[PDB]
Design an enzyme around this catalytic site. Structure first.
Site, PDB file in Angstrom:
ATOM      1  N   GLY A 145      51.396 -54.431  72.118  1.00  0.00           N
ATOM      2  CA  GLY A 145      51.208 -53.270  72.971  1.00  0.00           C
ATOM      3  C   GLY A 145      50.400 -53.513  74.224  1.00  0.00           C
ATOM      4  N   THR A 146      50.207 -52.460  75.011  1.00  0.00           N
ATOM      5  CA  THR A 146      49.454 -52.536  76.265  1.00  0.00           C
ATOM      6  C   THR A 146      47.923 -52.492  76.141  1.00  0.00           C
ATOM      7  OG1 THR A 146      49.321 -50.151  76.687  1.00  0.00           O
ATOM      8  CG2 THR A 146      51.373 -51.290  77.304  1.00  0.00           C
ATOM      9  N   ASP A 174      50.663 -60.258  79.075  1.00  0.00           N
ATOM     10  CA  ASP A 174      49.987 -59.096  78.541  1.00  0.00           C
ATOM     11  C   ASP A 174      50.185 -57.850  79.385  1.00  0.00           C
ATOM     12  OD1 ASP A 174      48.889 -60.899  76.604  1.00  0.00           O
ATOM     13  OD2 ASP A 174      47.083 -59.704  76.541  1.00  0.00           O
ATOM     14  N   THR A 186      48.458 -51.664  68.436  1.00  0.00           N
ATOM     15  CA  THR A 186      48.798 -50.256  68.568  1.00  0.00           C
ATOM     16  C   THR A 186      49.721 -49.986  69.748  1.00  0.00           C
ATOM     17  OG1 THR A 186      46.795 -49.392  67.558  1.00  0.00           O
ATOM     18  CG2 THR A 186      47.911 -48.000  69.145  1.00  0.00           C
ATOM     19  N   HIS A 208      43.446 -65.332  68.602  1.00  0.00           N
ATOM     20  CA  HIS A 208      42.606 -64.783  69.659  1.00  0.00           C
ATOM     21  C   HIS A 208      41.848 -65.814  70.477  1.00  0.00           C
ATOM     22  CE1 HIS A 208      42.570 -60.534  67.729  1.00  0.00           C
ATOM     23  NE2 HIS A 208      43.471 -60.619  68.688  1.00  0.00           N
ATOM     24  N   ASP A 234      50.643 -65.780  76.890  1.00  0.00           N
ATOM     25  CA  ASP A 234      51.878 -65.003  76.909  1.00  0.00           C
ATOM     26  C   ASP A 234      51.697 -63.943  78.013  1.00  0.00           C
ATOM     27  OD1 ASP A 234      51.193 -62.628  74.214  1.00  0.00           O
ATOM     28  OD2 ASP A 234      50.333 -62.972  76.189  1.00  0.00           O
TER      29      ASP A 234
HETATM   30  N1  LIG Z   1      37.231 -60.860  68.970  1.00  0.00           N
HETATM   31  C1  LIG Z   1      38.228 -60.159  68.947  1.00  0.00           C
HETATM   32  N2  LIG Z   1      38.532 -59.341  67.886  1.00  0.00           N
HETATM   33  C2  LIG Z   1      39.630 -58.505  67.748  1.00  0.00           C
HETATM   34  N3  LIG Z   1      40.537 -58.399  68.671  1.00  0.00           N
HETATM   35  C3  LIG Z   1      40.313 -59.192  69.783  1.00  0.00           C
HETATM   36  C4  LIG Z   1      39.226 -60.052  69.991  1.00  0.00           C
HETATM   37  N4  LIG Z   1      39.349 -60.686  71.245  1.00  0.00           N
HETATM   38  C5  LIG Z   1      40.474 -60.203  71.753  1.00  0.00           C
HETATM   39  N5  LIG Z   1      41.127 -59.288  70.934  1.00  0.00           N
HETATM   40  C6  LIG Z   1      42.416 -58.583  71.198  1.00  0.00           C
HETATM   41  O1  LIG Z   1      43.172 -59.414  72.008  1.00  0.00           O
HETATM   42  C7  LIG Z   1      43.698 -58.736  73.186  1.00  0.00           C
HETATM   43  C8  LIG Z   1      43.196 -59.537  74.380  1.00  0.00           C
HETATM   44  O2  LIG Z   1      44.182 -60.507  74.821  1.00  0.00           O
HETATM   45  P1  LIG Z   1      44.281 -61.862  73.970  1.00  0.00           P
HETATM   46  O3  LIG Z   1      45.261 -61.678  72.854  1.00  0.00           O
HETATM   47  O4  LIG Z   1      42.952 -62.188  73.334  1.00  0.00           O
HETATM   48  C9  LIG Z   1      44.773 -63.295  74.968  1.00  0.00           C
HETATM   49  P2  LIG Z   1      45.138 -63.269  76.757  1.00  0.00           P
HETATM   50  O5  LIG Z   1      44.871 -61.910  77.346  1.00  0.00           O
HETATM   51  O6  LIG Z   1      46.577 -63.610  76.961  1.00  0.00           O
HETATM   52  O7  LIG Z   1      44.156 -64.377  77.474  1.00  0.00           O
HETATM   53  P3  LIG Z   1      44.175 -65.982  77.473  1.00  0.00           P
HETATM   54  O8  LIG Z   1      45.003 -66.488  78.592  1.00  0.00           O
HETATM   55  O9  LIG Z   1      42.803 -66.433  77.633  1.00  0.00           O
HETATM   56  O10 LIG Z   1      44.716 -66.546  76.102  1.00  0.00           O
HETATM   57  C10 LIG Z   1      43.228 -57.267  73.110  1.00  0.00           C
HETATM   58  O11 LIG Z   1      44.337 -56.303  73.137  1.00  0.00           O
HETATM   59  C11 LIG Z   1      42.351 -57.215  71.838  1.00  0.00           C
HETATM   60  O12 LIG Z   1      42.829 -56.247  70.885  1.00  0.00           O
HETATM   61 YB   LIG Z   2      48.083 -61.756  74.791  1.00  0.00          YB
END
Ligand SMILES: Nc1ncnc2c1ncn2[C@@H]1O[C@H](COP(=O)(O)CP(=O)(O)OP(=O)(O)O)[C@@H](O)[C@H]1O
Ligand SMILES: [Yb+3]
Ligand SMILES: [Ca+2]
Ligand SMILES: [Ca+2]
Lengths: 485, 143
Positions: free
Chosen positions: A287-288, A202, A257, A60, A200
């Site tokens: 997922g979305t 999203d 999910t 994350h 990646d």
């Molecule tokens: N602190 C946290 N705890 C749990 N889930 C988190 C979280 N921060 C983000 N997420 C999860 O991560 C998703 C957000 O996208 P991310 O996986 O964090 C990377 P990104 O959107 O590609 O941005 P980036 O370019 O900064 O890396 C959401 O669907 C959410 O479920």
């Molecule tokens: Yb992502």
């Protein structure tokens, strides 16, 4: 008309690799289904294109969009785009820390290596410039300048490793200071070797056509419903198949999910780019955004690929809402918006608004008993006539289906005024709770508009005079019957 | 959730001429319905004998709160149902019309006549306004 971007200009603002977005045109047409993406780190596009591995939900930490580590996921989150924001950096680091331990072996960290070609790309992007030489303990280094104020970087001439240190007098968000040290990046294990990760793709949403959903239903489960004599059970049965094969989602071990058609879409999408040459693995890993109920994000621009293979990019949240409204949710396509919208997401306390038609109607419909109660359960946060929670239960009585519309309107317009009565005398007692008086002055208004409506459907206070409250059985219902004529 | 428990417990006192949150099975059904369910006399039994094998017929929060504990399992599909309602309502007016029902139906295969369609709306319709609101759509889907 809505001011959106199109084609090439839209693809540029997306962050997606062109080849990839093109490969995605196919799928959008084939399955007839809208594919909506969230912003993609613009400094990650070339890394992705050159085949760098993208990241899953087991990582994350945020990516960087500046300095020599732009595009990668720095272990030290103060090098990420969340630079300078203490709470975010801390959450970032705690995340990287968990990834490294809770997934020991699968996720690691390694020294950033900026190769010959990447340096050039960073120059073209005006992100860093190769500076003067320098020697330290018999090692050749070339500085890497950046308009950054807190840090200073340099790269090793021998193995291309990049290092950073705090600047004279300067302090870190976390209040630190330190000299020269490698810049570590988050990596995943691939055949026993740690490989660096980058952003990646999203998915913000996926809107497939209802016909496309049909194909998801076994053609003999549907038949058993299409042939149900009784209608009321036939409908409920048709609806339950929609829920079952298109609406319902479930948590997956690594893809978060998502529903089942979404899993297939995921696979097709990852296959589509592989056919074009991407050698890093998957590019869409979960997922979305509509199921991201705990930590919802709200992006100004959404990149859309419609079923005709065209590229659209909305400018602002409101515009994203107009588009989806005009071309998806009101055009025979399966769609659902994040359940956290119009609420306070628990995770990040976000409060993202979205247009919900069910609420527009709230003002003109009367509440079911449940809604009446659950609004005495949430009302009883900031802090005995069960007859009301009964009438309302009477108003929405399925038995009503053996009567005529004319009949229905009559007994409902009655069962309503009934509820509008009990509520009246309750407010006639003690304003128990200062703010409860509102819920009722409010229900009264709804009940009013509801009754007043059914009446105009045929022929309020005007008639609320000539009626019985007096003795309490089918004697009151009598005068009523005659009054409506 | 807190509210989950808050809800049940909230109604549990709306009708309890006992004051000790220990009603009878005579009203147990009266509660489950004023809250949003429609249990059959058979169900209001087998359960009021298993968990409440006490031998008094007095139902208190600890009991009631645990019973709901289970029913509110698969039924909770309320979320999907509501999302489903939104799929039908193509014009986002908050109501499901006959015309809209035809669309959802034909696109799923089953072709229907304006006759049949208006028959479906009118069956689900409860207040006779010629349209179906979420409240009704819920009944027609649960009840
Ligand atoms: N602190 C946290 N705890 C749990 N889930 C988190 C979280 N921060 C983000 N997420 C999860 O991560 C998703 C957000 O996208 P991310 O996986 O964090 C990377 P990104 O959107 O590609 O941005 P980036 O370019 O900064 O890396 C959401 O669907 C959410 O479920
Ligand atoms: Yb992502
Ligand atoms: Ca409608
Ligand atoms: Ca109706």
């Amino acid at each position: 008309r809505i001011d959106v971007l199109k084609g090439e200009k839209a693809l540029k603002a997306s962050g997606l690799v062109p080849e990839h977005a093109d490969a995605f045109k196919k799928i959008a047409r084939e399955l007839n289904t809208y594919i909506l993406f969230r912003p993609v780190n613009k400094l990650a596009t070339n890394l992705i294109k050159s085949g760098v591995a993208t990241k899953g939900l087991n990582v994350h930490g945020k990516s960087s969009d500046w300095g020599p580590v732009a595009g990668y996921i720095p272990f030290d989150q103060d090098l990420s785009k969340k630079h300078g924001q203490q709470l975010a950096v801390e959450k970032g680091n705690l995340e990287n820390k968990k990834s490294i331990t809770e997934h020991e072996g699968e996720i690691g960290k390694i020294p950033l290596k900026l190769d010959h070609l990447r340096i050039e790309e960073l120059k073209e992007n005006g992100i860093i410039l190769k500076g003067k030489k320098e020697i330290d303990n018999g090692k050749k280094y070339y500085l890497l300048e950046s308009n950054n104020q807190v840090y200073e970087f340099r790269i090793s001439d021998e193995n291309n490793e990049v290092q950073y240190k705090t600047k004279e007098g300067k302090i870190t968000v976390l209040g630190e200071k330190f000299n020269w040290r490698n810049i570590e990046v988050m990596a995943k294990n691939v055949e026993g070797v740690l490989k660096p990760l980058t952003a990646d793709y999203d998915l913000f949403a996926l809107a497939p056509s209802l016909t496309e959903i049909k194909k998801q239903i076994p053609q003999k489960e549907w038949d058993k419903v299409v042939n149900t004599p009784n209608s009321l059970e036939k409908q409920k049965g048709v609806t339950n198949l929609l829920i079952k094969y298109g609406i319902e989602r479930k948590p997956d071990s690594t893809k978060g999910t998502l529903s089942n058609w979404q899993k297939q879409m995921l696979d097709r999408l990852n296959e589509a780019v592989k056919y074009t040459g991407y050698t890093g693995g998957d590019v869409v890993n979960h997922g979305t955004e509509q199921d991201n109920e705990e930590f919802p994000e709200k992006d100004n621009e959404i990149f859309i690929i419609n079923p005709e293979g065209e590229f659209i990019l909305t400018k602002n949240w409101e515009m994203t809402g107009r588009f989806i409204e005009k071309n998806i949710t009101g055009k025979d396509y399966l769609y659902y918006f994040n359940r956290s919208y119009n609420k306070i997401a628990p995770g990040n306390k976000a409060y993202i608004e979205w247009t919900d038609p069910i609420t527009k109607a709230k003002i003109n419909t009367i509440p079911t008993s449940a809604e009446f109660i659950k609004n005495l359960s949430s009302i009883r946060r900031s802090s005995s006539v069960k007859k009301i929670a009964g009438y309302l239960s009477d108003y929405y009585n399925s038995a009503n289906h053996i009567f005529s519309q004319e009949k229905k309107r009559k007994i409902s317009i009655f069962r309503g005024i009934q509820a509008y009565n009990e509520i009246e005398n309750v407010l006639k007692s003690k304003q128990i709770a200062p703010e409860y008086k509102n819920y009722f002055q409010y229900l009264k208004e709804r009940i009013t508009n509801q009754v007043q409506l059914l009446l105009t459907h045929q022929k309020f206070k005007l008639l609320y005079k000539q009626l019985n409250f007096t003795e309490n059985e089918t004697d009151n219902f009598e005068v009523f019957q005659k009054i409506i004529d | 959730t807190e509210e989950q428990i808050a809800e049940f417990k909230e109604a549990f006192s709306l009708f309890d001429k006992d004051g000790d949150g220990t009603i009878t099975t005579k009203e147990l059904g009266t509660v489950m319905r004023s809250l949003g369910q429609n249990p059959t006399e058979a169900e209001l039994q087998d359960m009021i004998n298993e968990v409440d094998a006490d031998g008094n017929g007095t139902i208190d929060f600890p009991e009631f709160l645990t019973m709901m504990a289970r029913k509110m399992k698969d039924t909770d599909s309320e979320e999907e149902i509501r999302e489903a309602f939104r799929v039908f309502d193509k014009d986002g007016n908050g109501y499901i019309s006959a015309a809209e029902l035809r669309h959802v139906m034909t696109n799923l295969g089953e072709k229907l006549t304006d006759e049949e369609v208006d028959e479906m709306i009118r069956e689900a319709d409860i207040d006779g306004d010629g349209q179906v609101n979420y409240e009704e759509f819920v009944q027609m889907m649960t009840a």
